[PDB]
Amino acid sequence: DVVMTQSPSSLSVTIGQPASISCKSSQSLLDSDGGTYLNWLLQRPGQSPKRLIYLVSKLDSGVPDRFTGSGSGTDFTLKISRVEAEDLGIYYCWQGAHFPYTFGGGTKLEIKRADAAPTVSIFPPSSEQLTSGGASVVCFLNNFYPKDINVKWKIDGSERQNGVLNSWTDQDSKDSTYSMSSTLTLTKDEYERHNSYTCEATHKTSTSPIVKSFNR
Amino acid sequence: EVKLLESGGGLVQPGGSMKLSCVASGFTFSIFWMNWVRQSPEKGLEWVAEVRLKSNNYATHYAESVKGRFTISRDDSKSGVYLQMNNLRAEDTGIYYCTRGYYGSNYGEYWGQGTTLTVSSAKTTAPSVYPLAPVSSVTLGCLVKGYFPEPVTLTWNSGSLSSGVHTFPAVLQSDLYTLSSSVTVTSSTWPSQSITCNVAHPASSTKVDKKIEP
Ligand SMILES: [Cl-]
Ligand SMILES: [Cl-]
Ligand SMILES: [Cl-]
Ligand SMILES: [Cl-]
Ligand SMILES: [Cl-]
Numbered sequence: 001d002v003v004m005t006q007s008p009s010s011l012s013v014t015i016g017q018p019a020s021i022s023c024k025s026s027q028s029l030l031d032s033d034g035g036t037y038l039n040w041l042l043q044r045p046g047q048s049p050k051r052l053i054y055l056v057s058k059l060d061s062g063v064p065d066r067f068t069g070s071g072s073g074t075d076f077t078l079k080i081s082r083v084e085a086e087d088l089g090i091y092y093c094w095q096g097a098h099f100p101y102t103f104g105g106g107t108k109l110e111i112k113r114a115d116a117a118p119t120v121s122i123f124p125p126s127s128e129q130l131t132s133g134g135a136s137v138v139c140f141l142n143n144f145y146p147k148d149i150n151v152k153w154k155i156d157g158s159e160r161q162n163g164v165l166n167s168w169t170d171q172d173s174k175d176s177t178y179s180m181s182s183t184l185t186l187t188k189d190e191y192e193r194h195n196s197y198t199c200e201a202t203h204k205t206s207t208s209p210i211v212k213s214f215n216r
Numbered sequence: 217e218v219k220l221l222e223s224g225g226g227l228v229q230p231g232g233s234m235k236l237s238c239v240a241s242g243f244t245f246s247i248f249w250m251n252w253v254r255q256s257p258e259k260g261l262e263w264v265a266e267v268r269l270k271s272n273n274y275a276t277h278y279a280e281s282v283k284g285r286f287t288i289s290r291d292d293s294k295s296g297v298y299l300q301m302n303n304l305r306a307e308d309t310g311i312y313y314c315t316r317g318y319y320g321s322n323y324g325e326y327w328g329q330g331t332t333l334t335v336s337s338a339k340t341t342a343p344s345v346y347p348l349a350p351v352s353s354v355t356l357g358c359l360v361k362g363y364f365p366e367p368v369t370l371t372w373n374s375g376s377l378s379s380g381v382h383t384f385p386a387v388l389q390s391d392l393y394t395l396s397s398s399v400t401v402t403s404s405t406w407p408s409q410s411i412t413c414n415v416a417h418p419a420s421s422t423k424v425d426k427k428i429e430p
Contacts, residue, residue, distance in 0.1 A: 001280070037320035048313060049261070051325040060325050092261060096320025100279050103261035121355040121398070126346035128426075129359075138348055138357055140398045142382055165394050167384040181384040181396045183359070214351040 002027050004093050004104035013083040014112040021078040021107045023093035028073045030097070037096035040069055040078045044089040045170040052091075053078070085111050086173050110147075111176040117205040118144035118180070122198070122212035125191060135191035137184045139199030139212065143177040146204070151182040154198040154213075160184065218242040220314045220328030227334045227365045227419065228304055236299040236331060238314030246270060248317045250290055250297035253327070256310035264288075264312070267297060281307070304335045334365040338391035343368060345415045347426040354403045356428050358413030360395040363420070370397045371414045377401075 003026040013019040023038070030036045040053040051060050053069040056076065066087075068079040080087060088111050093104040118141035125135045139151060147168065153160050163186050169179040182199060198213040224236040236252070252264040265288035266277045276288050287300040297314060311332050317324035341364045348357030360368055370383050380400040386393040399411065412427045 039320060048327050048329050049255075050327075051319070054320060054322065054325070058322070094261075094319070096318065099263075099266070099277050101263040101266075101319065103263075105260060119355070119400075121357070122351065123348040123357050124351060126348060126359070129344070129346045132344070134344070134361075136346070136359060136361065138359060138396060140355060140357060140382070140396075142355075142398060142400070165387050165389055167387050167396070169382055169384055179382040179384070179398070181382075181398070183394060183396060185361075 001100050002029075002095050002098050002102050004095055004102050006091075006093055006104040006107050008107060009105065010108045010110065012110040012112045013080075015085060016082050017112075019080045019083050019109070021091055021093075023071075023076040023078070023104055025074045025076070025095055027098065029076075029095050030073055036072060038069075038071070038076050039094040039096065040067070041092045041094060042087075042089050043092070044173070049092065083109070083111070085176050087111075088171050088173060088176070110171060113145050113176040115205050116143060116145040116177055118142065118149065118201055118203060118210065120199070120201055120210050120212045122214060124197070124214055124216055125188075130188050130191065133188055135186050135188045137197050137199075139182040139184075139201075141180040141182070141201055143172075143175065143179060144203065144205070145177050147171070147178045149178075149180065149201060149203045151180070152200040152202065152209075153182075153184045154196075154200060156194045156196050160186075218316065218326045220316060220326065222312065222314050222328045222331040225312065225331035225333045227336065227340060229337060230305055230335055232304050232335075234301045234304060234333065236301070236312055236314075236333075238297045238299075238328060240295045240297070240314075240316065243316070245290075245295035246292040250288075250317075251315040251319070252288060252297075252299045253313040253315055254308075254310045254333075255313070255330075256307075259307070259310075265299060301333075304333075306335050309333060309335045332366065336365065336391070338364050340364060340419050341392060342420040342422050343393075343395075343415060343417050345413065345424050345426050347413055347428045349428050349430050352403070353400055354406050356399045356401070356406065356411055358397045358399075358415070358426065358428075360393075360397075360415050362392045362394065363417055364392055365419055366393060368393075368395055369414075369416045370395065372397075372399050373410075373412055374414060377411065 043049040123138040313330040314328040343363035346359040383397040
């Protein structure tokens with residue numbers, strides 16, 4: 001199976017800036033018929049992958065001229081003349097000169113925007129959960145940048161690291177921000193024996209961490 | 217319009233069998249090669265199988281890891297291409313796309329939305345849904361906890377409330393998924409109006425609505 005190597009793995013670009021993605025194949029993609037069968041495709045999270053370019057440099061309909069493919073033999077390049085916020089997602093290169101047809105590892109395009117503080121919100125366990133024997137306190141962190149952020153939990157002073165489930169949304173195509181959910185899970189026996197709970201977000205958007213808390 | 221309707225996924229125990237179907241419409245079926253392509257977080261995008269035209273007695277080509285286990289076939293009458301899967305293992309888990317024609321050339325860009333396949337020993341569990349009320353604007357939440365397998369569909373007010381919604385991707389913890397979603401509305405609408413979290417889990421035949429109350 002022909003190996004398709006992409007570099008870099010992650011690409012962070014500001015709006016309007018040019019960007020490029022490299023793709024190198026283990027074998028030549030130049031077929032005997034004179035054609036070089038290399039594709040560029042883009043996938044937006046949760047949706048089916050869409051082909052952008054085929055035959056190295058030929059664009060599919062609907063694809064903007066900002067995207068330009070080039071290269072030959074084993075070396076190939078995807079070029080975006082000016083990155084827009086809707087260009088985000090994972091770009092894959094693909095070869096069709098040899099079966100099995102193979103894809104590259106992918107290159108995630110992150111839209112580089114201004115720093116944004118997370119809108120934090122903390123939620124105590126529901127009536128249905130406590131009466132069922134469980135207890136989960138949920139902390140939401142909506143619309144922030146950059147993605148790099150960590151949430152620390154605090155129960156009646158001390159901290160608990162076990163029982164935490166974190167989940168980041170994919171980068172929004174409109175505001176280029178991220179959202180993140182943090183759920184601290186324990187039992188009602190563990191919950192009712194304490195009062196104050198706190199989710200502590202440490203972002204570079206502020207010197208002191210942003211804090212939401214409640215007492216029950 | 218070129219349509220590739222995929223179906224036949226779902227949860228199947230390791231060593232089990234499953235047949236995927238792809239009913240094609242909007243084009244002449246018998247004159248196009250048909251493919252199956254899969255995707256997984258571990259292995260990325262993978263070509264599974266390719267089937268060609270009638271004159272060559274429908275020549276088939278498979279990826280190595282599925283040879284002897286997977287069989288692609290086509291019925292030009294029903295305009296369908298199928299993927300019979302035997303001796304399934306966990307590595308076969310993923311999203312399976314039906315595609316039309318040779319992908320390396322023109323006219324071959326069309327992929328279907330895909331169908332999900334989950335190969336696991338873990339059994340089907342119903343999700344526990346908890347409406348999250350708060351302790352400028354108001355943020356509401358909904359907690360979908362302890363379900364298997366994927367997926368679930370969380371909507372707000374039967375799909376009416378679409379703006380200011382953050383549905384977070386499922387996270388697997390101890391063979392159980394946990395999903396959450398946040399909604400932000402103006403404080404003059406809630407609790408003035410009613411906001412209900414709608415969660416559906418077809419694998420466990422679950423359709424439960426939970427109203428949010430202070
Ligand atoms: Cl079409
Ligand atoms: Cl389709
Ligand atoms: Cl046709
Ligand atoms: Cl066969
Ligand atoms: Cl056949």
